Design a protein around this ligand. Sequence first.
Ligand code: GNP
Length: 395
Amino acid sequence: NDLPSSFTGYFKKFNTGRKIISQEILNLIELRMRKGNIQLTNSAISDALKEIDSSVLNVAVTGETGSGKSSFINTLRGIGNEEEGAAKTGVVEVTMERHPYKHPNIPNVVFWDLPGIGSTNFPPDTYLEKMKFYEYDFFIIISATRFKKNDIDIAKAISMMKKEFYFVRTKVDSDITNEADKEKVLQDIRLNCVNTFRENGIAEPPIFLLSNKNVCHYDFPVLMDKLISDLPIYKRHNFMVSLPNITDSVIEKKRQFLKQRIWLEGFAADLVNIIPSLTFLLDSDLETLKKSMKFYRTVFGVDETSLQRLARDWEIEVDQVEAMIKSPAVFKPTDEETIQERLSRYIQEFCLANGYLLPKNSFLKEIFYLKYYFLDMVTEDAKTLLKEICLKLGR
Ligand SMILES: Nc1nc2c(ncn2[C@@H]2O[C@H](COP(=O)(O)OP(=O)(O)NP(=O)(O)O)[C@@H](O)[C@H]2O)c(=O)[nH]1
């Protein structure tokens, strides 16, 4: 009801698995706001943001040759096996070495292509030392069949390291085009695998069936969703904005994480008692806003580049695509209206639709209502295009 509750209350609308900050740290903050420690209150918030931003993710991807490591690594990086920078390493092995692949627009996220353990005379242990297992947040164990012994021995060596690991069963689509002229045809895969684990002295483990081709029609949505949950809270935000924008819910989950960061930021910069109006912009604020808009656009796959490589796929004109959404106009110069008049209208619209988000007479600075507005605009666009991207399919 008062400010301290308003601050932590904002996070109530996000279930445990989608919080960008821990409930313990949140209470420690509300606590300081109540004890009257402006030092530690702005300090706490500030460190939580620094730790959230500076988080570096390192995903190890392992498995036999042709299991699907390259395509998985590319699918998460949101790029085609052909596109520039794609992890087009079928049977590299011109070096039985570990290969790193950064995320195109979201650095801090790095996938590692690990040479199958069966391509080296290294025992389950020696292998992970050379591969530097200690450098990874989690492991993606990929298998085409129903997993081999090697896969289990790796997991065992990994769990003995307190590290996370996930069993991903790829090529399911390539196993459906052999039973058509889905149903329990999946149970099969789900069974062979479960029988392999029950064959290597381990309880039944979670398994994620999926096709790199049909990027979002199986356990893929559940996996990505699970990776985020299992990640230490502070590591969530950076890996979440990097995931592929496959479903509305994925887009939405991204907005929810980003809404939370805008909130933490607004409070860090200090609340004000003057109603937002943007009567005077300021060049430093305009530059910040321009970067925020650019970032969000990248994250939701609606930036300039992404729109270009979307027109050639529809044989339409870039400008034609841009007209389909609203995010690209915001900073598009016009003789008819100033960027100030426009931004001013944005704030007014926003606050009339959402209120000020805080108790009476307390408001975030103008720049943050704007950042929320841009966030809504950009997520809607993503859902717009994505939607149109689904009509023109192959079925
Ligand atoms: N249908 C289908 N094909 C797939 C899938 N994944 C990989 N493929 C195909 O299988 C081949 C081998 O997969 P690839 O990505 O090279 O796996 P890899 O694990 O990296 N091989 P290596 O272990 O030797 O490095 C490629 O022809 C690719 O087109 C999939 O999920 N569905």
